[PDB]
Amino acid sequence: SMEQVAMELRLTELTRLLRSVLDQLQDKDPARIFAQPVSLKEVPDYLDHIKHPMDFATMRKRLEAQGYKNLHEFEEDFDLIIDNCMKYNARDTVFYRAAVRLRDQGGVVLRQARREVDSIG
Predict the structure, then answer these.
(1) DSSP of 59-100, one letter per residue?
(2) Straight-line distance from the first to the last Cα atom of the chain, in angstroms, rounded to the nearest whole number
(3) Which helix or strand (DSSP H or E) is residue 25 part of?
(4) DSSP structural state of residue 4
(5) Number of domains the chain is built from
(6) Domain at 77, CATH number
(7) Structural domain range at position 60
(8) Local structure of 101: helix, strand or coil
(9) Which of 68, 78, 85, 114 could bridge 99 with an S-S bond, Cβ 3.0-4.6 Å?
(10) How many CA atoms lie within 13 Å of 23's alpha carbon, on the beta-carbon side?
(11) What region does 55 belong to: left with phi over 0, alpha with psi -120 to 50, or beta?
């Protein structure tokens, strides 16, 4: 149908906007601490601690499959990156501190994304 096409164009455009959001959030991680999944070879107990692992490469795979229906779903995944790190790692670690800085800097980007998503519809 024409409607299904219109819906598909909306999703494509959301995916375009979320791709730009993802690039901007990932720039706030210049150390690449959150770029890839925590390695289960190197942290073999990780899944005993963290039940829903997340990272920027995994978000990118979902994004490019158009697997984010709305900004809320995308934000859920970004929040998992941060919250998983802040539980697994102690406060006095470069990893925890990186997550705090990513959260703080990401807030600004996500604030405007929400306005853009609502605005453009």
Answers:
(1) HHHHHHTT---SHHHHHHHHHHHHHHHHHHS-TTSHHHHHHH
(2) 21
(3) helix 2-27
(4) H
(5) 1
(6) 1.20.920.10
(7) 1-121
(8) helix
(9) 85
(10) 6
(11) beta
